[PDB]
Symmetry: C3
Amino acid sequence: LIDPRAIIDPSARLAADVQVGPWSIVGAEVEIGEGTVIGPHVVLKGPTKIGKHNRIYQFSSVGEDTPDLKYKGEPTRLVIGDHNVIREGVTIHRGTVQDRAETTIGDHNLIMAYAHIGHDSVIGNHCILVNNTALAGHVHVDDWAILSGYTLVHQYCRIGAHSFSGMGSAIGKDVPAYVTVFGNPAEARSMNFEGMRRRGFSSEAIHALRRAYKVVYRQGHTVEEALAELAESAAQFPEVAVFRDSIQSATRGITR
Amino acid sequence: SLIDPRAIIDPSARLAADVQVGPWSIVGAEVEIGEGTVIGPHVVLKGPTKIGKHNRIYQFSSVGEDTPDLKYKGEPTRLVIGDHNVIREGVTIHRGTVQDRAETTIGDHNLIMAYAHIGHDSVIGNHCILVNNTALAGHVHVDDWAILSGYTLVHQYCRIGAHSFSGMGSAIGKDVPAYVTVFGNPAEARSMNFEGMRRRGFSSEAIHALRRAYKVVYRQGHTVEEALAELAESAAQFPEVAVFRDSIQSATRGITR
Amino acid sequence: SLIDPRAIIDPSARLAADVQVGPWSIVGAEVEIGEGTVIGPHVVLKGPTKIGKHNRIYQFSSVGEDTPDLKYKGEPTRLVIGDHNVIREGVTIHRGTVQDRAETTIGDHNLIMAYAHIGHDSVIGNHCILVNNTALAGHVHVDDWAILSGYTLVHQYCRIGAHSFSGMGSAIGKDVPAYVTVFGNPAEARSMNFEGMRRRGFSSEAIHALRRAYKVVYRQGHTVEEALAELAESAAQFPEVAVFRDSIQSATRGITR
Ligand SMILES: C[C@H](NC(=O)CC1CCCCC1)C(=O)Nc1nnn[nH]1
Ligand SMILES: C[C@H](NC(=O)CC1CCCCC1)C(=O)Nc1nnn[nH]1
Ligand SMILES: C[C@H](NC(=O)CC1CCCCC1)C(=O)Nc1nnn[nH]1
């Protein structure tokens, strides 16, 4: 299981069942959950906690210190969930004292080659981060978010549930749930109707959401004016309340 | 000698004459490697994969991996690499998928630069250059002498025509015809790689037939069918224009405009 | 020891006494590493190269490989890196070409983030910052205190001015004057890196001058000679303006507008 060419630091805690490939480093205070498969040439620095049945591929550096000068070598943390996939050369950095001191990844998230998850970035579940997708720092990605290849997400930006970025998107403002965004700078185009039929969203909920969009983007309404309109469809449909709440948590602004 | 002992060469692996494998490089199960190919250190080779003669693969490259696009993978899908290719630091080449060609194909004399990516089932021809972090996103066909500038993105199923040029940070979404220069995100069509044509020792008549050919397709409100019918004479006259007419003809998915 | 025993230290390498080199890192022939510098694991150091004092080089970085550039024929070119620099995970830095000055120079106190690229013959000055996946083509001169944001691209022979700033995903085809802010693909100008000046503690008097100097090049519809002329006066009165006008003078490719 643990290849004899791996460096498993004394103060590790590799729960039994964990595979480590040759020439891989498991650093200080690195909890690796059970069922996991660490590939070869993988560096794990801590203090870090990895969940179960994850897979980390060759040349990935999970749990390093952000290079951000502001951060001054404090003993901060990173937490990955169960059933994730972390592809070749992905970098995932631990938190900062200037925020939550915990970088957090949830469950069932696919994180493709040379993706970056900067300090204090919080990822939900069932997400897809395509090759070279880069989360600046303090980035929240709610469940089922698909970010196309080479998507750049600016600091403190919240990516809504079931949202979708086009290839080479540069996201500066918050992406509401279900919304699709494209180009640099990113601009709202439509809802992610494919992503709704993936959940088996009722044709009413898809149609109620198709409306909920026009209210925000194509009816000349201020944000606060828009939230008031939705509140009844938000009250009736749980799905619309995800979309409604996603807007309401954008102090800085929504991607238009 | 040529095989470094800190490397891991699986029993099934077939290493030909003059092959070098740097220290800590994995040559995986059912990886065939051809004459005088150099594998650097920190290279992962996963099979079933065929690598031809006199290739040079650099460190941190992951050649012949499975596409993550399918979470429950299929086997056996192939990666066929040809002869005299250069694959630079940290390149990622994925093998085919059973639901398409079931092979990723790379030809001869290609230059694939640092941290570039060739997605599953993508075909590459000869003398192609993929600049740093150029990314092909599955079932992509790249014909000969095609130059993709730094960080060019190619959408699923797009066709990169022969002698075509993409500007840096381009997001190609529709087919790129042979010779056509594309730029930006989404990629718009500007002109033709006249510089590339001249380097190939193309006749000035052929280059001027290709200049007048560009305008027929792009600049004169013709339908693709009208445009093709108009190129019939110039194409039969010049093999170089035929390659252009051919590339537009194969584009059912539409051409980059 | 400080030299981890699973490292390769070529006989002809010159490592200072207190140098640290982590496991499975190559330190090849005619590679010089100065005092205090800390090499991480899985690093490839190729020469002829010279690394200064108190540097840090993270896992998977390949410092001193040949440019894959075809015009390079395998000459004895050099790479030189100064003191107090930080080179993050999977950075690629290439030695120079005889075609230019057979050397790639990085100065002191520069932070170069993960999967960033520094092409052949590229001169990086002091206290610069290259954010994740920033790619410099070749013959690129980045002067002191420059901040290129994540996934910024820079064409051949482009010269990034001092205290200048690019935005994330910027694509730079022309020169960035000193202090200017450049954004998008292609790169556009949008007044100057003011908070950058207010950070280092630039004079209130000079910031008004740089603001009125910016109005000349960009906003008064002068030709570059008409603007270079109208600047001379204000440019003689202030160093900051001279450095701005100097950066404008030395633009071989033209300036970003
Ligand atoms: C789902 C797919 N996502 C990708 O990331 C494709 C990337 C291309 C470059 C190489 C790495 C993969 C996509 O369809 N993106 C898209 N299409 N139109 N606008 N955005
Ligand atoms: C072929 C070359 N490729 C490059 O990639 C140039 C840089 C090095 C790598 C990082 C991205 C910039 C190029 O110059 N393309 C181009 N010219 N004008 N617009 N695009
Ligand atoms: C300093 C920061 N640079 C970054 O690189 C932050 C992110 C790192 C990785 C994810 C994508 C960018 C920045 O200035 N961004 C910006 N603001 N306006 N235009 N660009």
